[PDB]
Design an enzyme around this catalytic site. Structure first.
Site, short mmCIF file in Angstrom:
data_model
loop_
_atom_site.label_atom_id
_atom_site.label_comp_id
_atom_site.label_asym_id
_atom_site.label_seq_id
_atom_site.Cartn_x
_atom_site.Cartn_y
_atom_site.Cartn_z
N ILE A 116 -3.22 -46.26 9.27
CA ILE A 116 -4.16 -45.62 10.22
C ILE A 116 -4.90 -46.73 10.95
CG2 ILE A 116 -4.24 -43.58 8.73
CD1 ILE A 116 -7.14 -44.19 8.14
N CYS A 117 -5.14 -46.52 12.24
CA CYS A 117 -5.91 -47.45 13.07
C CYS A 117 -7.26 -46.78 13.28
CB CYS A 117 -5.17 -47.70 14.38
SG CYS A 117 -5.93 -49.03 15.33
N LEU A 118 -8.30 -47.41 12.79
CA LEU A 118 -9.67 -46.89 12.96
C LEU A 118 -10.24 -47.49 14.24
CD1 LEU A 118 -11.04 -46.89 9.29
CD2 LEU A 118 -9.78 -45.14 10.53
#
Length: 165
Positions: A116-118
């Site tokens: 996941i890319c925050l």
């Protein structure tokens, strides 16, 4: 600040962690893992009282690899996703990278391997709280809000389908 209050609201009632130790740090790492499990189980208990019991996590014996499941409700249908992450050697200064392997492959706000890319605000938030935040806070401030954007988007785009029964 709005950011300070929003953080306080979300991590209210999650026990804070103490020990600056990572996987190579022997007795201090054992202590850090007690803090991690005490924070996680209180967060789970709170979530049950909130009717938002949304994840389970387990670790290997050394606490260096974590895996489990998260759940997301959209239009009353429940979606389950396997999650996993390794603990970086420089934890807890460095945040772990959560992977949702079944969602791997050219989707918005993700890297290869289904990491996941925050947003950019998460990393400095983590940095300015070291070593108080742990895996409960990574879930509450990281994966939780990520799911609330990405899962509705992927359902609307017909990428994610609900399994009947």
């Amino acid at each position: 600040s709005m950011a300070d209050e929003a953080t306080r609201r979300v991590v209210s009632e999650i026990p804070v962690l103490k020990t600056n130790a990572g996987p190579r740090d022997r007795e201090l790492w054992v202590q850090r893992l007690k803090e991690e499990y005490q924070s996680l189980i209180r967060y789970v208990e709170n979530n049950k009282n909130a009717d938002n019991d949304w994840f389970r996590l387990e670790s290997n014996k050394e606490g260096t690899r974590w895996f489990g499941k998260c759940w997301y409700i959209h239009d009353l249908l429940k979606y389950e996703f396997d999650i996993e992450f390794d603990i970086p050697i420089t934890y807890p200064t460095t945040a772990p990278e959560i992977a949702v392997p079944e969602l791997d492959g050219k989707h918005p706000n993700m890297y290869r391997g289904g990491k996941i890319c925050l947003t950019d605000h998460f990393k400095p938030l983590w940095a300015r709280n070291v070593p108080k935040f742990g895996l409960a806070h990574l879930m509450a401030l990281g994966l939780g809000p990520w799911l609330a954007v990405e899962i509705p988007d992927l359902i609307q785009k017909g990428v994610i389908h609900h399994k009947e029964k």
